[PDB]
Write a protein that binds this ligand. Structure first.
Ligand code: MET
Length: 240
């Protein structure tokens, strides 16, 4: 009898957070159906077509990129958590250990590629051109200080090529799934993780939907905040 609303998810840690949310909104007689997808575009297109009411897997710059490129009308209804982006290495233990010519793999979707490039800039490896913007890519690199080779790779595959490159800038969700902690294993962290807070997203016009608001309240509630602080003591995933 409870009405059902679908929420698209990509992977941990968002999936576990939606499971906590599912239990909580069940109390208001809302049955949260967690729908599992395999790629970024499919998740946003499903919300645009109306196959699911919301999704939970990206940050605002990514959503903005999708709106611009795919004529989307998605909006964030709230920040939920931050997952710091970090540079990891299969062998080097210090950022200054990287030899000239070292190969560093980074995300290939523009908003996370820019984010990763600004992380490497902050660590002193490169300098980005001035009017680069939120969707900057390797073509925007103005100077290569440490003489590094930057390889663009699909985010989900970064952990798979990790043992074959000198380093890799890996999104927190994929790093955690591969046993990497930005605090314990990272050699450098992005300069502004809070700007890349992950958000609950819906089509413009559904922000006030009462079911959406309940899921949001549950994702930002004391029980989720408590869960995060306890499971990710290094702040790998932290309430926004
Ligand atoms: C699809 S945008 C990237 C989301 C990812 N969980 C991150 O915060 O790096």
């Amino acid at each position: 009898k409870d009405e059902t609303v679908g929420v698209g998810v990509l992977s941990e840690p968002h999936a576990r957070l939606l499971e906590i949310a599912k239990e909580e909104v069940k109390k208001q007689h809302i049955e949260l159906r967690i729908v599992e997808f395999t790629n970024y575009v499919a998740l946003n297109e499903a919300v645009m077509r109306g196959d699911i009411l919301m999704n939970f897997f990206q940050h605002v710059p990514h959503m903005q990129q999708f709106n611009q490129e795919h004529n989307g009308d998605l909006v964030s209804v709230g920040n939920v958590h931050v997952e710091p982006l970090a540079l990891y290495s299969r062998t080097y233990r210090h950022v200054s250990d990287f030899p000239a010519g070292a190969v560093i793999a980074i995300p290939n979707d523009s908003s996370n590629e820019a984010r990763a490039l600004r992380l490497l800039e902050a660590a002193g490896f490169i300098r980005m051109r001035a009017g680069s913007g939120l969707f900057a890519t390797v073509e925007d690199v103005q100077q290569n200080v440490r003489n590094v080779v930057l390889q663009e790779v699909e985010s989900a595959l970064l952990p798979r090529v990790f043992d074959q490159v000198d380093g890799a800038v890996i999104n927190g969700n994929y790093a955690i799934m591969a046993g990497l902690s930005a605090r314990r294993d990272g050699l450098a962290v992005e300069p502004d993780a809070s700007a890349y807070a992950n958000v609950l997203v819906v089509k413009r016009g559904n922000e006030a939907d009462a079911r959406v608001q309940a899921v949001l309240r549950a994702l930002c509630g004391g029980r989720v905040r408590t869960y995060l602080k306890e499971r990710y003591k290094g702040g790998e995933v932290a309430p926004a």
